[PDB]
Amino acid sequence: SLDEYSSDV
Amino acid sequence: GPHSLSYFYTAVSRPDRGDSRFIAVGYVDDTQFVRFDSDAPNPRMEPRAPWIQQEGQDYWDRETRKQRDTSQTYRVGLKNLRGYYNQSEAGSHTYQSMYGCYLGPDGLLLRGYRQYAYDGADYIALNEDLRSWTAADTAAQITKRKWETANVAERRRSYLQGLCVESLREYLEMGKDTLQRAEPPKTHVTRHPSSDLGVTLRCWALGFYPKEISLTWQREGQDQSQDMELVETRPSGDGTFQKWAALVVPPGEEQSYTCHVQHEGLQEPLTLRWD
Amino acid sequence: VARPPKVQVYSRHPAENGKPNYLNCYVSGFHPPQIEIDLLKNGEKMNAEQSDLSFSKDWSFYLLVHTEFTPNAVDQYSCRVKHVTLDKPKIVKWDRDH
């Protein structure tokens, strides 16, 4: 199952 | 042995189209089981191993939602990286990420990781403590500061200790007939002509799973790795792997050399020779 | 700096004339990911399936291009790769011994 969190570079 | 769940993300800019393409794949050990491609019409998380197809619609819907969001975030990142590095829109660039959990012997997290690259170079990485970052240059220090401000490390540690391990355990049981069967190599040695005082013996290992293997040549038990040719382990196409090792030996002396195979699917190492 | 592809061409099973098999072009170690990989039969491109783009711990990409084929005594197979690290396309020929 994927890590849902995205954080902009 | 130490099972793993890993995901691999690639985002690439396309100046021709003025956009980008995001592709993700997931693996349990050496078996790919899911993919996502933002170029697909109506892009969705898709099964790539038969055993993941027993997940219901909630799973496919929710994984798809995560990837659509992530894919957007990586398109913005490509623009940001372009600025950090004073690059124009004329050329293509690549932003990659990979993360995963290695399951210990006790079913506990042995090691969780999350790292990033830009144009093939290490960019930033979560340290082993799952608490802090290491940044590779000035640009990555800006990222590091942003992610510290927003406490991204706690989000990653939570995932790698919680859902990553929990879901891997489910996949391993779900697919136990394949993910937990060690498939031993089928092995043999072939013989071929060569050059001046030269005959080549090739020790084959075919159809093994998982991918890790040891192939070596010996004369009287002395390792011949200096003069042998060892090809990179390569996929069979059917989920298994292939590899071979070859050596030039003096004509008539074939029986002095033995090929040695170690693979977790064999009770004991194999010894074989030209027959 | 870009990294060039390594290329291996091989059959799934030991080849035997007249027996159906699979033909594999495995291409690995390369960066950036844009690449053209073509399986050839007597120089003409075959319509071969390509694996999903993935990469290794060192960030370099790998792809498998593969198709069904029935080897025999006359037909020649090769894999042809174009990448920015290659000024002329790389061509590796298939043979039963590698």
TrEMBL record, chain B:
Descriptive protein name: Leucocyte antigen
S-S bridge residues: 101-164, 203-259
Keyword Transmembrane helix: yes
UniProt record, GO biological process: antigen processing and presentation of peptide antigen via MHC class I; immune response
Designated gene of the protein: sla-
Major location (coarse): membrane
Compartments reported by the entry: Membrane
Domain Ig-like: 185-271
UniProt family annotation: Belongs to the MHC class I family.
Membrane topology label: Single-pass type I membrane protein
Whole-protein residues included: 22 to 296 of 361
Reported function: Involved in the presentation of foreign antigens to the immune system.
Lineage: superkingdom: Eukaryota
Keywords: Glycoprotein, Immunity, Membrane, MHC I, Signal, Transmembrane, Transmembrane helix
GO terms under cellular component: lumenal side of endoplasmic reticulum membrane; MHC class I protein complex; phagocytic vesicle membrane
